[PDB]
Amino acid sequence: VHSQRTVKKIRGNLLWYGHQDSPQVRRKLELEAAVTRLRAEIQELDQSL
Amino acid sequence: LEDEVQTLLKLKNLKIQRRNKCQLMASVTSHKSLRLNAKEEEATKKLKQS
Numbered sequence: 001v002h003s004q005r006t007v008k009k010i011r012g013n014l015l016w017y018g019h020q021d022s023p024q025v026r027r028k029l030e031l032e033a034a035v036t037r038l039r040a041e042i043q044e045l046d047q048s049l
Numbered sequence: 050l051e052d053e054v055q056t057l058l059k060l061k062n063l064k065i066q067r068r069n070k071c072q073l074m075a076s077v078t079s080h081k082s083l084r085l086n087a088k089e090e091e092a093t094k095k096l097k098q099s
Binding site for chain 2: 028031032034035038039041042045049
């Protein structure tokens with residue numbers, strides 16, 4: 001049993017971070033980073049060409 | 050997003066499959082240029098000895 005502010009704190013912390021730490025958010029972010037790495041590779045390979 | 054990733058991946062696959070081709074093309078161009086440079090020497094020796 002806690003205070004109301006502490007319970008809202010813990011509930012908001014979990015319900016926001018677990019939304020942020022979901023593996024679906026992580027896989028979307030790494031696919032966006034993969035797109036970034038891929039057109040960076042496009043630029044570098046075209047520069048070498 | 051995966052479609053975009055694989056299209057860029059096959060783009061770079063064809064880029065490598067033309068990269069080795071470009072290595073071959075630089076090779077044959079360099080050989081033909083050195084061939085012409087070696088063709089210069091008959092012209093020089095025929096200009097000198099004759």
